[PDB]
């Protein structure tokens, strides 16, 4: 069991209950703005052909998941770097003092940073994130994939974000809060506790997106299971 | 290949 299997349980329970078919859908009663996330992906660039997936988190930190499965994260101080090897070791470096071996990758991260700053909007620019406590470290991108309709971004804090290309709607799912934040086409946002959606129901729009979210989470879980099987030999 | 511009 992991963040993903907990999320799948949460989504299965709300979805099984057919929330848009409740006698009186009381979607507003399920809102819990206190559970807004601490982190989400505000910008991304898919350079996966050659290099990796670059992204900005809502605190203005940036990171990259490189094709060789290493990661580089740059804090919103603009100088502190965290590098993660394939096998998980974190090294703490800085833009000003770092091993020359990482020149190429640090240069790539700067390219993403600068590209995103020049060209891309900040998702959830109108959202004040939740304040994280002692242990709420900067997460990084655990894995991601794209479908015809969406990009799916899974962070190391357990959150799963799904951004829909067609209509710019977004979901941010957190298995710790057991909550979902939905950003609609007007960029209005609401956060819901999943158990309250099961209790009170919701509109067809949100219900459909939660069905898609479950499908995506099953995909993440199967990949995770596969890589764990390989890892355990 | 990128988020909203």
UniProtKB/Swiss-Prot annotation, chain A:
Renumbered residue ranges of the record's region Linker: 123-137
Domain POLO box: 40-118, 140-222
Effect the entry attributes to changing residue 57 to A: No effect on centrosomal localization, nor on S-phase progression. Loss of centrosomal localization and of S-phase progression
Chain positions with Phosphoserine modification: 5, 80
Record location of the Glycyl lysine isopeptide (Lys-Gly) (interchain with G-Cter in ubiquitin) cross-link: 122
Annotated stretches, region: Important for interaction with phosphorylated proteins: 168-170
Name of the protein described by the UniProt record: Serine/threonine-protein kinase PLK1
Source species: Homo sapiens
Gene responsible for this protein: PLK1
Residues of the full protein shown: 371 to 603 of 603
